[PDB]
Design a protein around this ligand. Structure first.
Ligand SMILES: [Cl-]
Ligand SMILES: [Cl-]
Length: 162
């Protein structure tokens, strides 16, 4: 197991524009296209991302390309973030993937705000961090996914994905 497989399980794969859990236009493997309510805006953003006139449909290879770019950006956003970097550096390989997942889903800014949990993760207080991460809208809106992530942070293993 790795970050790619992990997120592919959490995000799924869809080749046609769709609405995510928040109602926003997305495509491929959880690639957010736009927060705007306009499907045209979504289609414009898609074409621009892909470099071709798509008509809201891409190929599996295209989805994967978007995916790699997106995983790369998440890691990079973590590395450049003063609140995130130190946490990520203090963690083991498994748990770093859990942090990347949260970043991919929530955004750098969103994750950077879990101050208290961040601090708990840094101290390696697993059970405590797990409890604190659960007190959040994130857990409340997407409980199954959050549970998977939180378990990964608590155990340092891939059990929740097997
Ligand atoms: Cl892009
Ligand atoms: Cl869920």
């Amino acid at each position: 197991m790795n970050i790619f497989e992990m997120l592919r399980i959490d995000e799924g794969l869809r080749l046609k524009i769709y609405k995510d859990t928040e109602g926003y236009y997305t495509i491929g493997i959880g690639h957010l296209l736009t927060k705007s309510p306009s499907l045209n805006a979504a289609k414009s953003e898609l074409d621009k991302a892909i470099g071709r006139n798509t008509n809201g449909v891409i190929t599996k290879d295209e989805a994967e390309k978007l995916f790699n770019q997106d995983v790369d950006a998440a890691v990079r956003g973590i590395l450049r973030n003063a609140k995130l970097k130190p946490v990520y550096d203090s963690l083991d390989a498994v748990r770093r993937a859990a942090l990347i997942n949260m970043v991919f889903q929530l955004g750098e800014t969103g994750v950077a705000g879990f101050t208290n949990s961040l601090r708990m993760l840094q101290q390696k207080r697993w059970d405590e961090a797990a409890v604190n991460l659960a007190k959040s809208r994130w857990y409340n809106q997407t409980p199954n996914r959050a549970k998977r992530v939180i378990t990964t942070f608590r155990t340092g293993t891939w059990d929740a994905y097997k």
